[PDB]
């Protein structure tokens, strides 16, 4: 009913569409980046993981923090021992847009264990705003996850809860993933997830919605499925770890299909 | 924004927010008639405040005629400016200083209207008011009516999770969140809407109540308590207690007795209990009450 919005989702659905592409970071922008690396890019974004689990803050809240950080690292050169402030303030920014009860600022300052001042984070926080033009209603791959979810038949909290894992994943590694606007990496994860979980294939329901296929979402996922089988191996775990909590039904578990006849 | 406070001239104090002081100010170089929101980042351990970055972020996306139209953001080390298109009155103060013997029909009819297309629009682009309610809606000269202070509003997901309860001005607000749902939707705004169409006819709030449990109290005595037939779930959320008095639901007639046969059933449809079965702002715009409304759609500003 009202909770799923009958008489605004594809007016939503359609305005988020229009909006990711807007929001979209330079896909080639670490190239332009001197200093920075895709390798430290993930170290931060998995230590972001790890924040979000420590505050007990909303996955969404890391979604929006990525996409700031993504963005920002897009038209501003950041040196390497800077990287974690741009972070922090991207967190910051993203509690207080999503959360209901944001952590203080004195603690996002604590978790950086002194590096870095108040007054550093707060005028960091004011740059990030200035560069986003407080662009900060950001889709992210959840935003479109929790809708391909009302096309389950019927609800299955381990195909749900994989794609909200496989798409965390896909925040870890700018490339390839910088190049998928978020619609299309949740069409992935939703139809590795339900291929996985069930066995079923994305929906031609969600074909309808969406107009994606599988033969548009296969780049992506050729991708996705080889970050999944790849996952225990990466030098980045702490999405894993967050997924072995019954909170998601352990799906970190689950073992990954080893070919998906695509 | 490319904006500098030197080009506005300040005119005279309108407002304050517990964030803020609002000016009337003029644009020195284009004529134009501004409000000036200051939000004093000093003044604050915390930096840029919550209620602000959703303000504008919102804002700035929000377009539409019946939607104050943020225009400019100036962003000095100390302070926030918010430049706002200005509009020279709220409906509250319209209510109660020119409307003593009341709103003609045809005017409450264009506001509800007008309201309804703002608040459509919303909904559409995934925001919730959160705080509708008279001082919070703007009437110009040309009688546009507008939705302002987004500082309690939120961007949703589909479906929606579970955000701020300590949500709504009392008297506008809906018996979902007073009875501690975990979820609630766009029917709140619509719900708000509702208290503010029949305050319109009556020039009275609806249900003025002096706190949570007597706000329902008031609501359940004008609707009736609510049971399983009427909103399947109501005794299973958090703070419905078996032992709320079973009061009988009223004749709408006795409820605003001044309103027509559409007028009514409208009003009904705005303060159904099940949030599930209450109208969107995208279906009360074709209801029949509005067949008669002719006053031009007012132009979006740039
Ligand atoms: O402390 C370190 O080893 C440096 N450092 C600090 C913080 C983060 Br996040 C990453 C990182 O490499
Ligand atoms: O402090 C540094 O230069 C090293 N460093 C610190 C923090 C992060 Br995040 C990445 C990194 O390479
Ligand atoms: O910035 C200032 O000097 C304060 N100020 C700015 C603008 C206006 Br209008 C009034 C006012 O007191
Ligand atoms: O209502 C707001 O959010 C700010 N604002 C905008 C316009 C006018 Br007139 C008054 C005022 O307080
Ligand atoms: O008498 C009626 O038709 C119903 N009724 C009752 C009471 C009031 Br006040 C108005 C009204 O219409």
């Keep these: ?144 996850l929790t809708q391909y ?114 | 924004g490319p904006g500098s406070m030197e080009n506005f001239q300040k005119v005279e104090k309108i407002g304050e927010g517990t964030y803020g002081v609002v000016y009337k100010a003029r644009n020195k170089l284009t004529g134009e008639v501004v409000a000036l929101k200051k939000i004093r980042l000093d003044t604050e351990t915390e930096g840029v405040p919550s209620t602000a970055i959703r303000e504008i972020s919102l804002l700035k996306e929000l377009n539409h005629p019946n939607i104050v139209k943020l225009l400019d953001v100036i962003h000095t080390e100390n302070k926030l400016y918010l430049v706002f298109e200005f509009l020279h009155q709220d409906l509250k103060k319209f209510m109660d200083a020119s409307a003593l013997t009341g709103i003609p029909l045809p005017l409450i009819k ?43 509003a939120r961007a949703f997901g589909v479906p929606v999770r579970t955000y701020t309860h300590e949500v709504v001005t009392l008297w506008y607000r809906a018996p979902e969140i007073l009875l501690g749902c975990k979820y609630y939707s766009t029917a709140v705004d619509i719900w708000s809407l509702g208290c503010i169409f029949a305050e319109m006819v009556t020039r009275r709030a609806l249900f003025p109540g002096d706190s949570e449990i007597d706000q329902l109290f008031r609501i359940f005595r004008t609707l009736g308590t609510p049971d399983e037939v009427v909103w399947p779930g109501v005794t299973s959320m958090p703070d419905y207690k078996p032992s709320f008095p079973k009061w009988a639901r009223q004749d709408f007639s006795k409820v605003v007795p001044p309103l027509d046969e559409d007028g009514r059933s409208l009003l009904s449809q705005m303060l159904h209990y099940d949030p599930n079965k209450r109208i969107s702002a995208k279906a009360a715009l074709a209801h029949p009450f509005f067949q008669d409304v002719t006053k031009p759609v007012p132009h979006l500003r740039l």
């Design chain 1, 1 to 144: 009913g009202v909770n799923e919005v009958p008489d605004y989702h594809e007016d939503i659905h359609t305005y988020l569409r229009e909006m990711e592409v807007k929001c979209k970071p330079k896909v080639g922008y670490m190239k332009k980046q001197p200093d920075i690396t895709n390798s430290m890019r993930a170290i931060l974004v998995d230590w972001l993981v790890e924040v979000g689990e420590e505050y007990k803050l909303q996955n969404e809240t890391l979604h929006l923090a990525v996409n700031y950080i993504d963005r920002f690292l897009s038209s501003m050169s950041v040196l390497r021992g800077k990287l974690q402030l741009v972070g922090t303030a991207a967190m910051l920014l993203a509690s207080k847009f999503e959360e209901i009860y944001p952590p203080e600022v004195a603690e996002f300052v604590y978790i950086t264990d002194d590096t870095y001042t108040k007054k550093q984070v707060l005028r960091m926080e004011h740059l990030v705003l200035k560069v986003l033009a407080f662009d900060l209603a950001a889709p992210t791959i959840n935003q479109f």
């Design chain 1, 149 to 262: 979810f009302l096309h389950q038949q019927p609800a299955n909290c381990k195909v749900e809860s994989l794609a909200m894992f496989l798409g965390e994943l896909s925040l870890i590694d700018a490339d390839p993933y910088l190049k998928y606007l978020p619609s299309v990496i949740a069409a992935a994860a939703f139809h590795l997830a339900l291929y996985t979980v069930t066995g079923q294939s994305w929906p031609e329901s969600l074909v309808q919605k969406t107009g994606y296929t599988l033969e548009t979402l296969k780049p992506c996922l050729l991708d996705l499925h080889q970050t999944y089988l790849r996952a225990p191996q990466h030098a980045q775990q702490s999405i894993r770890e967050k997924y072995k909590n019954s909170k998601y039904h352990g799906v970190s578990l689950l073992n990954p299909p080893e070919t998906l006849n695509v």
């Design chain 2, 110 to 152: 264009s506001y509800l209207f007008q309201l309804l297309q703002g608040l459509a629009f919303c909904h559409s682009h995934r925001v919730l008011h959160r705080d509708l309610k008279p001082q919070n809606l703007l009437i110009n000269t040309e009688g546009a009516i507008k939705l302002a202070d987004f500082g309690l």
